[PDB]
Write an enzyme that holds these catalytic residues in place. Structure first.
Site, mmCIF file in Angstrom:
data_model
loop_
_atom_site.group_PDB
_atom_site.id
_atom_site.type_symbol
_atom_site.label_atom_id
_atom_site.label_comp_id
_atom_site.label_asym_id
_atom_site.label_seq_id
_atom_site.Cartn_x
_atom_site.Cartn_y
_atom_site.Cartn_z
ATOM 1 N N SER A 156 52.295 22.429 25.929
ATOM 2 C CA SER A 156 52.568 21.695 27.178
ATOM 3 C C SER A 156 51.767 22.260 28.364
ATOM 4 O O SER A 156 50.552 22.110 28.365
ATOM 5 C CB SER A 156 54.054 21.670 27.472
ATOM 6 O OG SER A 156 54.298 20.674 28.459
ATOM 7 N N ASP A 196 57.261 13.281 20.814
ATOM 8 C CA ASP A 196 57.181 13.664 22.242
ATOM 9 C C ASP A 196 57.206 12.404 23.116
ATOM 10 O O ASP A 196 56.371 11.512 22.965
ATOM 11 C CB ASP A 196 55.896 14.501 22.481
ATOM 12 C CG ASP A 196 55.872 15.211 23.833
ATOM 13 O OD1 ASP A 196 56.342 14.634 24.845
ATOM 14 O OD2 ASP A 196 55.390 16.377 23.863
ATOM 15 N N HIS A 233 59.352 16.812 22.429
ATOM 16 C CA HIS A 233 58.685 17.829 23.224
ATOM 17 C C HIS A 233 59.299 19.224 23.093
ATOM 18 O O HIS A 233 58.583 20.251 22.930
ATOM 19 C CB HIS A 233 58.694 17.400 24.689
ATOM 20 C CG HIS A 233 57.804 18.251 25.534
ATOM 21 N ND1 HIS A 233 56.428 18.114 25.527
ATOM 22 C CD2 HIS A 233 58.087 19.274 26.385
ATOM 23 C CE1 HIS A 233 55.902 19.000 26.370
ATOM 24 N NE2 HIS A 233 56.885 19.717 26.901
#
Lengths: 345, 347
Positions: free
Chosen positions: B137, B291, B320
């Site tokens: 991320s 995600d 995620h």
């Protein structure tokens, strides 16, 4: 000023009498706002029921879905569009007096809407079966509840972008949507003087709908730009905030509480397979491919439990709010599926 | 007392000196919190850099990803985990004085972290190239920025669940996350008496993370129950709210602002294809299948612009926050891809 016949009409207000509600309170009178398109035939075999969706009215269903060369064609069918209890046109927080006014309005369930619609159709139309019940999202919740609660009444059912029993993830989404409104101090526990005093909460509500209502692919590929909004900011401000700005917070909360609790397994002690096993209608289950919260998986899981049903997903990167008619190719798909359903015995 | 050695250590605080920030302010001294696992080999050719993600610290990268049975194996590699500027361990609103204290803390960009990390590696460790840059991320955002800004320095790059240029949808998500905090009156424009005073904002922030951070399938199939939480309510309260409860609102806003603006095309006048075309690193682009906001489609569109690269999605309905190590299948896939990446011949 938002909830008027000039904005949403024409419609008829039909008093169906007292309505005992599942949560325990009784409406002394329940007014249903009904729009009828097309004539009922002598067999009364061509009636289609169209429930309305979250924050929506019969006018949206008429503008987006009903017309000449469409599946929902009033030259062939009597299309009966019935506004949700709590939606501002039927009896709602915003238009009822006495103990039901404003935040006093009762907690209404999907089953209460279906019960009222059943009373409407049998007693005011003399209809004893429906050629089709079709709705999107909350309209699909009511479609499933019809098919399960009155199984021989519903000949065909089309559940677009919605489920028969609400998920925990969807419940959370709606809880956050509710809190966007109720945490605005101007909400004043529902006693706000005017809708627009709660503009901040309604805007926050709209931003969340922007996040969850379309899809990442919708924005990545510039669909908002194709719709006339040059940026996310312009789209949020010009489309989404403007859509919710004139609406009534109490009404939105009535429909959000109801949406949270849609559950046809209430008829069968929480056994969903048993409830869906009761459906006799020829049923099409039609999720939208990119819907972020009524997912293809959610709906396919339910379809497998419905006897004689078909899985007919709509392909649209516009996701859930593709229901608003932003994607004409999606509408063409939907018309083809619905015409085929109507053509089947 | 959340941001301590007791909770996140061991780590060392390294002063890399003044840091002129992209946005225009100068940090008079930038302290980076660094955790090192494993020894450098003779020619320092086995260094792996691991940036940290939003709300995270080096402790998380260590606990979830580093170990002898793993791809990031400290018996073979020197794994250097560097805490984001703004994350409460490195120089941040919560621990810096002068005009940078609290609400005064500067707007820090992904590029500022990478520049600081580069100074750390060359000037403090004497490292002149990296065997691998890997992060998830915001960690992936720093990974892309590394591969574009110093293309010869980065021999291999693994970008897990993140993009090289942030989307409008992701920017909106983070805006909504920010407002969950800033609309709490207790926030007091960053002058709150304590973290704890802003609990309402932090809980709303946690609920939004629950909505977007996993997937509808995660919940539908009862993953939260497998993880030991009886209900969505117990999961939201016992996992998600608890995670964010002790954290500092000003630090979260620093990382959020940064996250919103990750954009390697700033190097090439907004031309992303030109920026990604600069990458020389052998690169694996690894979105997580479910995600909700760094999508497979988002990452695929960038991977197509990176020469030499491969598209290797991680299959996980945890979405995620599968980055948190909840999904052992996903960790097993990741180790396999990373081991394959690390075996690419040295040129």
């Amino acid at each position: 000023s938002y909830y008027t016949e000039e904005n949403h009409g024409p419609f008829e207000l039909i008093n169906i009498g007292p309505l005992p509600l599942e949560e325990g309170r009784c409406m002394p009178e329940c007014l249903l706002a009904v729009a009828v398109h097309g004539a009922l035939n002598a067999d009364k075999s061509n009636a289609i029921l169209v429930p309305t969706w979250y924050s929506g009215t019969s006018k949206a269903m008429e503008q987006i879905y009903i017309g000449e060369g469409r599946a929902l064609d009033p030259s062939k069918y009597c299309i009966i569009v019935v506004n949700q209890i709590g939606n501002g046109l039927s009896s709602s927080a915003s238009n009822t007096g006495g103990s039901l006014a404003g935040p006093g309005f009762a907690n209404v369930r999907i089953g209460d809407d279906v019960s009222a619609q059943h009373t409407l159709l049998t007693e005011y139309f003399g209809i004893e079966s429906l050629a089709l019940v079709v709705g999107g999202s909350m309209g699909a919740q009511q479609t499933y509840e019809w098919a399960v609660r009155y199984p021989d009444f519903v000949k065909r059912a089309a559940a677009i972008a919605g489920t028969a029993r609400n998920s925990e993830h969807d419940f959370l989404f709606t809880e956050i949507l509710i809190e966007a409104i109720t945490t605005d101090p101007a909400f004043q526990a529902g006693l706000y003087r005017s809708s627009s005093a709660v503009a901040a909460g309604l805007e926050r509500h709209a931003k969340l709908w922007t996040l969850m209502g379309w899809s990442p692919e919708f924005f990545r590929t510039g669909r908002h730009k194709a719709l006339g909004f040059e940026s996310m900011q312009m789209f949020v401000d010009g489309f989404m905030k403007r859509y919710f700005a004139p609406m009534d917070p109490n009404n939105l909360l009535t429909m959000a509480w109801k949406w949270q609790r849609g559950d046809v397994s209430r008829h069968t002690g929480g056994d969903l397979a048993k409830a869906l096993g009761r459906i006799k209608a020829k049923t099409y289950v039609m999720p939208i491919s990119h819907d972020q919260f009524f997912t293809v998986d959610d709906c396919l899981s339910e379809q497998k439990m419905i006897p004689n049903s078909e899985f007919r997903p709509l392909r649209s990167i516009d996701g859930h709010l593709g229901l608003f008619g932003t994607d004409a190719q999606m509408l063409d798909q939907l018309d083809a599926h619905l015409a085929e359903l109507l053509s089947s015995p």
